[PDB]
Amino acid sequence: QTSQSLYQALWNSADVLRSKMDANDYKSYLLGMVFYKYLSDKMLFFVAETMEEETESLDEALAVYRKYYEDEETHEDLLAVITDEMSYAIHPDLTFTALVERVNDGSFQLEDLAQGFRDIEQSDELYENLFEDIDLYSKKLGATPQKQNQTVAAVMKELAVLDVAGHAGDMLGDAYEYLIGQFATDKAGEFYTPQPVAKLMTQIAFLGREDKQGFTLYDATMGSGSLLLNAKRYSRQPQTVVYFGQELNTSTYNLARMNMILHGVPIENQFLHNADTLDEDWPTQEPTNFDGVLMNPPYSAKWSASSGFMDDPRFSPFGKLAPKSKADFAFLLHGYYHLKQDNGVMAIVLPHGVLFRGNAEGTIRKALLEEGAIDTVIGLPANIFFNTSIPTTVIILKKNRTNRDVYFIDASKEFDKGKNQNIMTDAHIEKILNAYKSREDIDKFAHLASFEEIVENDYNLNIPRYVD
Structure with a gap:
């Protein structure tokens, strides 16, 4: 029924x-x-x-x-x-x-x-x-x-x-x-993205373009494809959405292929690749830039960080390479590299680390901020993912913005108690989305930081530095 x-x-x-x-x-x-x-x-x-x-x-x-x-x-x-x-x-x-x-x-x-x-x-x-x-x-x-x-x-x-x-x-x-x-x-690698979180990220990516036919959506660490398929419900032209996704695990890759067929995605709108997202860049054949990018990369993953990547267009513009032990930023820069400068919107959920860690990551963060790549920083409640209890952050990125300000939203308290977990409801998601659309300071909830404020914080994006 x-x-x-x-x-x-x-x-x-x-x-x-x-x-x-x-x-x-x-x-x-x-x-x-x-x-x-x-x-x-x-x-x-x-x-x-x-x-x-x-x-x-x-x-x-x-x-x-x-x-x-x-x-x-x-x-x-x-x-x-x-x-x-x-x-x-x-x-x-x-x-x-x-x-x-x-x-x-x-x-x-x-x-x-x-x-x-x-x-x-x-x-x-x-x-x-x-x-x-x-x-x-x-x-x-x-x-x-x-x-x-x-x-x-x-x-x-x-x-x-x-x-x-x-x-x-x-x-x-x-x-x-x-x-x-x-x-x-x-396990402790690529975790399933909770529906409420998926909804928030997808609604933001499609905001104002729900009627666009041929909207291109990319996830370079798609997993079972579950995150991408949220497009089916938040786009009003679901059968014209063109999906681009990459997954390393062959078994998970196959599950994603199944997931796509079962959600009725047309054969011609599916571009799935089984490969390592950080080693060889994909896609290389046009189009390589997409209207939307949604990602929940592997948790606590490590990567090559081979000196060779400093010649890679995805990372060379950002001073230093993400640390071998923390692939977080490498995944983010990869997604960003594939985001259309014309209205492209990207959402990526990661641990808080990238917001405050120093050294290489600090250098990359700084470079990102100088070009206004980081549009919004959203703090999610702790214990909402199944394989870790840590609070995470959803980062929204956009290119060519006139304003280099960053909008912070502390939604760590937006949740109901659940069965060994915390649950986010539609009302919680709607509250966050509403703040995002406004970019207005809200008592103990959101704060629009100017570039100078960001600078005075030495480019550290730790949420508590901005939201009471």
Whole structure:
């Protein structure tokens, strides 16, 4: 009925997996299998719809598909329409619906699902290697094949009942997002960005351009793509938003590809790259500058800081390179390098360090401030991220500003108590957004600092120096 209950049902459907392994282990099975069900259900409803024999009975849709699939007079045209529509076609017997029928017939063969995955992967480079993180024969599913088959089968049966295409509408997207978030709560690197925070960053990036078609959005440390996909709700032209994202972890990269497809992002509006954002700059081919940049880089990451980077356009303009031990600023300069000087807006959430640390970082901060790169500094409540309890900061950057002032907002107190965490509500986000739009001093909440004030603080941007 709702994304919440759809999320709950999808999560529960993996119960037979919770018994034999932890979340990090069954994560790929659940997320990948839900993804495949979506591709399969969507195709079937599409076939039935196109052949003017609309039925929300997937079993009936499969019957319709088989019928036209078997007729020489319709075979090739059917596949053409499917392929034109979604760039993939799945053999009738390999559809999730058909395999579940096998399960209930007592003839399900694990190899058929694998073949199904391959059907998709080989359909277009868009889907290649997508299911690689799934091992249907791992001992964790069971010691014997009958045990491995039985386990995967139990997941499919629970999954089979749930409606994900045809009516979930954009609910499936949110439900899938909830699943990813839930898996996030379970390391210390690239952390999941809490929805409230994602909303604030995205609303700021799109402010005044909600109707712009072809708005380009870039995240150089996208993770599961969850942050980027917030554009789907805050832009009024969601189907024309062009996404550019980069992720180093291949497994996470694949999850992001899935996330994009499940949020209905058109194939032509997806530009995802699997690589290290700091080593080789991407993209290099125009366009390289974007309307929006949203980033939540890896927490406490280190980087090369090779002397060679002082010849890199991304860092050379800023005096010194970010320290080997603190890649924070390197990620920020990389994002900034890719921000359009014409109205481009960038939001990046990082720990407070970059605001006050000295030496190299101080030098970079200073250079940034001299050209008015730092537009707004927002202090977030402590304990809102799942993998660290530290308070963080959302920094808003813009190029070519006339005013080199910095607007500080201390929102560390904007939160409600939650279950082992602090929660930010829409009202809290709205309060911050309202301050941001005004750039006005607000009692114990916000303060617009002039460049001279910044200078008298010796370029230190520690929030408490500006907001009471």
